[PDB]
Amino acid sequence: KGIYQTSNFRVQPTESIVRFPNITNLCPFGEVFNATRFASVYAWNRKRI
Amino acid sequence: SVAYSNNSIAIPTNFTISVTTEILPVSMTKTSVDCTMYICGDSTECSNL
Ligand SMILES: *[C@@H]1O[C@H](CO)[C@@H](O[C@@H]2O[C@H](CO)[C@@H](O)[C@H](O)[C@H]2NC(C)=O)[C@H](O)[C@H]1NC(C)=O
Ligand SMILES: CCCCCCCCCCCCCCCCCC(=O)O
Ligand SMILES: *[C@@H]1O[C@H](CO)[C@@H](O)[C@H](O)[C@H]1NC(C)=O
């Protein structure tokens, strides 16, 4: 006989959403992994993606 | 320096009624902790671990 604490009142999620930026192009995998010429290791090439 | 002598006494001829405060703590706040919401709040994998 008495009063007992329990877990706090939980509310479960109803659905899942995904928010990504409006991006259409594919990344240059052919330009990076299938390039005709590759740089030397002392002058390694850095490309911004 | 109390004027001590072997045959001298000091006797009050009047009085003062004095009221003073004393402040005592009695209780503090009762707190409860949900462990799952503190450590692993709304995460099922953390609760399973
Ligand atoms: C005992 O002490 C009280 C309190 O200090 C004295 O009462 C005061 O007496 C003076 C002079 O008569 C008055 O101006 C004050 O208004 C009195 N104060 C209060 C609160 O009544 C009292 O006279 C003292 N008695 C003796 C015999 O010394
Ligand atoms: C053209 C480069 C695009 C840059 C993308 C950076 C984001 C990181 C995602 C991973 C991309 C490379 C994954 C390599 C694929 C390995 C496949 C395999 O195991 O055979
Ligand atoms: C890689 O480059 C070569 C030479 O340009 C080409 O023949 C080949 O089709 C390319 N492969 C891909 C997957 O782009």
Distances in whole angstroms, Cα of residue A1 to Cα of each of A4, A5, A32, A37: 9, 13, 72, 81
- What are the helix (H) ranges across A1-49? 29-33
> Are A49 and A28 within 8 A, CB to CB?
yes
- Which amino acid residue places its CA nearest to atom 8 of ligand 3? A34
Which two three-digit tokens encode residue B19? 């009221």
What experimental approach yielded this model?
cryo-EM
Resolution of the determined structure in angstroms stands at: 2.3
Ligand nearest to C-alpha A26: 2
Cβ of B32 within 8 Å of Cβ of A5? The answer is yes
DSSP A25: P
The single residue listed with the structure tokens 């006989």 is A1
> Are A26 and A49 within 8 A, CB to CB?
no
> Are A8 and B37 within 8 A, CB to CB?
yes
Which two three-digit tokens encode residue A39? 């740089």
Q: Which residues of chain A make contact with B42, given a CB cutoff of 8 A?
A: 10
Which two three-digit tokens encode residue B40? 């692993």
Q: Which residues of chain A make contact with B30, given a CB cutoff of 8 A?
A: none
Q: Using a 6 Å CB cutoff, which residues line ligand 3?
A: A 30, 34
Distances in whole angstroms, Cα of residue B10 to Cα of each of B4, B5, B6, B7, B15: 10, 11, 12, 10, 14
Instruction: Report the first-to-last Cα separation within chain B, whole angstroms.
Output: 74
Which two three-digit tokens encode residue B42? 């709304």
d(CA A27, CA A49): 7
